[PDB]
Amino acid sequence: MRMQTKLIHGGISEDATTGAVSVPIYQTSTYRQDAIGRHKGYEYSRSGNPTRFALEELIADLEGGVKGFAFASGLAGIHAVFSLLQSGDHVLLGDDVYGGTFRLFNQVLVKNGLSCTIIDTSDISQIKKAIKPNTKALYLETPSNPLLKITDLAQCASVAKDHGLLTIVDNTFATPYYQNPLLLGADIVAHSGTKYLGGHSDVVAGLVTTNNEALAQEIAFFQNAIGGVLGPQDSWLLQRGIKTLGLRMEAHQKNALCVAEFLEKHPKVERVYYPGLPTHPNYELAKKQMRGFSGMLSFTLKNDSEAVAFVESLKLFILGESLGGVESLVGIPAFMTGLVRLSVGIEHEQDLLEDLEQAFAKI
């Protein structure tokens, strides 16, 4: 079965006992057991839950892993991933990773004996040079946010492997529909389900999956030990949202192209950051490792002062703080995470252009 068919029938997508084409929401905390040391499969909802498990199975099935793990948020998942390491360990970050991941290290992890080194990861040599005797992981994120900066996954993975290093990839922007880091040498993949996977701006969730059984034992342990689990209703809604991913990602791509092209041939606009443009640095690398480009695009205007007047005069893009939803979103990462980030939604392309038009006419 193909990706499109897997989004609908993958993992667990059916109640085995009733035939329900939808996995039931197990709003429960505990489970009755036959004799002690002989359970019915589930013991306690923090450790495992049939609804959450179905979702965890789905994301594993999609990214080509052995196990999935659903979390209360993207950050909670990432946090649990880094709980695999001791104090005295080192991690190499990309120079433009998501701000909350930076704050995770800066303010939570570093504090606990975990050191990081920020480097440009599209500069393969900057990673070669940055490894210390205690470096235990390489944390990549491509396309990056904002700026959509592409990193070479297979290369970095190869390089991380001949050193005793973990390749941990944040696949949020380019979904499992467009990119599968585990098939390119990654050990652990993390998403914000809060974004595209959910895709209706109505769930806060993180998903992690892995290629490695030993890694999976570890991640499980810390999901259970720290307990930042995804609830069953959210799990169910995430899975429901995931069902449409393919169609949504297609529509996201189609729209964001029209938007990028229109923006590039504009008098008010200077540079434009989108992976689908032949004009974007490493465009070739992208077509190599991505089956498509999402709906994210940063960009800048020649007049750097108007940035805030432009964003605030738009009437169809929602001025808000997330991305990856069916509604188009807009931000300015200066005060949020003269650069303007667009999360192109799945509204009619013309209405999106007409909305950008009228907001340009105003500056």
CB of 283 to ligand PLP, least distance (A): 22
What character string, x for contact with its own copies (CB under 8 A) and - otherwise, covers 325-354?
x---x--x--xx------------------
d(CA 18, CA 177): 30
Contact partner at residue 172 from its own copies, ligand PLP, none, CB < 5 to 8 Å by partner kind: ligand PLP
- Residue span 111-150 as binding mask against ligand PLP, x where in contact by CB under 6 A, dash where not: ----------------------------------x-----
Q: How far apart are CA 9 and CA 154, in angstroms?
A: 29
75 touches ligand PLP by CB under 6 A? yes
Residues of this chain, 19-38, that bind ligand PLP according to CB under 6 A: none
Kindly state whether residue 13 participates in binding ligand PLP, applying the rule CB under 6 A. no
Residue 146, preceding peptide bond in cis (omega within 30° of 0): yes
| Minimum distance from residue 8 beta carbon to ligand PLP (Å) | 24
Q: Please report, as residue ranges, which positions from 110 to 169 form the binding site for its own copies (by CB under 8 A).
A: 111-113, 115-118, 129-130, 132-136, 161-166
From 113-121, 188-196, 240-248, 266-274, span contacting ligand PLP (CB under 6 A)? 188-196
When CB distances are held under 5 to 8 angstroms depending on the partner's kind, the choice from ligand PLP, its own copies, none that residue 174 binds is none
Separation between Cα atoms, residue 192 and residue 197, nearest integer Å = 8
Neighbouring CB atoms inside 10 A of 123's CB total: 14
Q: Give the amino acid at 16.
A: A
Is residue 187 within 8 A of residue 65, CB to CB? The reply is no
Among 10, 65, 74, 199, binds ligand PLP (CB under 6 A): 74
Measured CA to CA in angstroms, residue 137 lies from 134, 169, 191, 286 at distances of 9, 11, 18, 23
Report the residue number, 133 or 278, with the smaller CB distance to its own copies. Answer: 133
Compute, in degrees rounded to 10, the torsion defined by CA atoms 246, 250, 252, 255.
Answer: -170
Q: Which of 53, 98, 177, 299 binds ligand PLP (CB under 6 A)?
A: 98
Q: Which residues are catalytic?
A: 46, 98, 170, 195
Tell me how crowded residue 194 is: count the other CB atoms within 10 A of its CB: 25
Reduced to 3 states (helix: H, G, I; strand: E, B; else coil), residue 226 is helix
Task: Answer positive or negative: Cα dihedral of 208, 256, 140, 247.
Answer: positive
Residue whose C-alpha is closest to residue 259's, from 199, 333, 188, 314: 314
Candidates 6, 39, 46, 161; binder of ligand PLP (CB under 6 A) is 46
Q: Which of 206, 231, 275, 292 binds ligand PLP (CB under 6 A)?
A: 206
Q: Which of residues 203-262 bind its own copies (CB under 8 A)?
A: 203-204, 206, 214, 217, 221-222, 225-231, 233-234, 237
Of the candidates 171, 194, 209, 294, which one interacts with its own copies according to CB under 8 A? 194
Burial 209-226 (b: 16+ CB within 10 A, else e): bbbbeebbebbbebbeee
Site residues (vs ligand PLP, CB under 6 A):
46, 73-75, 98, 100-101, 145, 170, 172, 192, 194-195, 204, 206, 227
